[PDB]
Amino acid sequence: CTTPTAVAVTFDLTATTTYGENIYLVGSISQLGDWETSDGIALSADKYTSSDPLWYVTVTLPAGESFEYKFIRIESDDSVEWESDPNREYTVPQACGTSTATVTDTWR
Numbered sequence: 001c002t003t004p005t006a007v008a009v010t011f012d013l014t015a016t017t018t019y020g021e022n023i024y025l026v027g028s029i030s031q032l033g034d035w036e037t038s039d040g041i042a043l044s045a046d047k048y049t050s051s052d053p054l055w056y057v058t059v060t061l062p063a064g065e066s067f068e069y070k071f072i073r074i075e076s077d078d079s080v081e082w083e084s085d086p087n088r089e090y091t092v093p094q095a096c097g098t099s100t101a102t103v104t105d106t107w108r
């Protein structure tokens, strides 16, 4: 191991913003409130040049336990859209050697 226990997970959600919004990844953990997209995981068009139509993402979750992973597409007009259908639960372990994995999803 090393010392820190941050879980950098890369998520890739295929959606489409309107040049001004964010597709959220709220998980049930403090770094991932999951129930407050405020501290979830926003995916955007970073490489993309528009706003965030395929909304990719690469954030971290420092804990090493079970965190929920509900997704909520944040928008520019109304607000979010908690896609609570395709949900998950990243049970990040406390061990080391793999404190970062993937988290794929897509809007439909």
Ligand SMILES: OC[C@H]1O[C@H]2O[C@H]3[C@H](O)[C@@H](O)[C@@H](O[C@H]4[C@H](O)[C@@H](O)[C@@H](O[C@H]5[C@H](O)[C@@H](O)[C@@H](O[C@H]6[C@H](O)[C@@H](O)[C@@H](O[C@H]7[C@H](O)[C@@H](O)[C@@H](O[C@H]8[C@H](O)[C@@H](O)[C@H](O[C@H]1[C@H](O)[C@H]2O)O[C@@H]8CO)O[C@@H]7CO)O[C@@H]6CO)O[C@@H]5CO)O[C@@H]4CO)O[C@@H]3CO
Pocket (backbone or CB within 6 Å): 014, 015, 016, 017, 018, 019, 045, 047, 048, 049, 050, 051, 052, 053, 054, 055
């Ligand atoms: O059905 C979903 C599909 O619908 C369309 O959505 C566009 C819409 O067509 C258009 O009106 C657009 O206009 C604004 C937009 O925000 C800007 O991107 C741009 O609009 C055009 C632009 O003028 C064109 O040059 C066009 O060229 C392409 C370019 O490679 C790139 O822009 C591409 O999309 C970029 C996004 O950053 C990224 O998401 C990804 O695109 C893929 C996404 O995964 C899909 O969600 C997306 O579906 C949309 C399309 O955006 C569009 O057809 O398209 C791709 C997969 O289908 O790659 C790029 C990252 O660099 O989009 C072009 C496709 O060859 O780009 C857009 C048209 O896409 O100027 C406007 C701002 O003033 O708004 C919507 C928003 O997507």
Ligand SMILES: OC[C@H]1O[C@H]2O[C@H]3[C@H](O)[C@@H](O)[C@@H](O[C@H]4[C@H](O)[C@@H](O)[C@@H](O[C@H]5[C@H](O)[C@@H](O)[C@@H](O[C@H]6[C@H](O)[C@@H](O)[C@H](O[C@H]7[C@H](O)[C@@H](O)[C@@H](O[C@H]8[C@H](O)[C@@H](O)[C@@H](O[C@H]1[C@H](O)[C@H]2O)O[C@@H]8CO)O[C@@H]7CO)O[C@@H]6CO)O[C@@H]5CO)O[C@@H]4CO)O[C@@H]3CO
Pocket (backbone or CB within 6 Å): 028, 029, 033, 034, 035, 036, 037, 038, 082
């Ligand atoms: O006004 C915006 C608030 O809602 C957020 O946006 C949406 C979000 O998806 C959700 O809140 C929902 O509204 C309610 C939902 O329909 C209910 O199903 C329920 O959700 C439950 C879920 O199963 C899940 O989230 C789970 O998670 C726990 C979490 O693990 C706890 O830590 C914590 O527990 C309590 C606790 O009292 C306290 O932490 C409190 O603190 C606030 C927190 O910041 C958010 O929950 C906030 O919600 C707003 C948020 O900003 C929007 O992004 O308000 C909380 C204060 O009430 O959180 C809870 C609530 O007391 O949170 C939960 C609960 O233990 O548990 C929840 C709840 O049991 O509740 C949802 C909220 O009422 O839809 C929103 C938009 O439609």
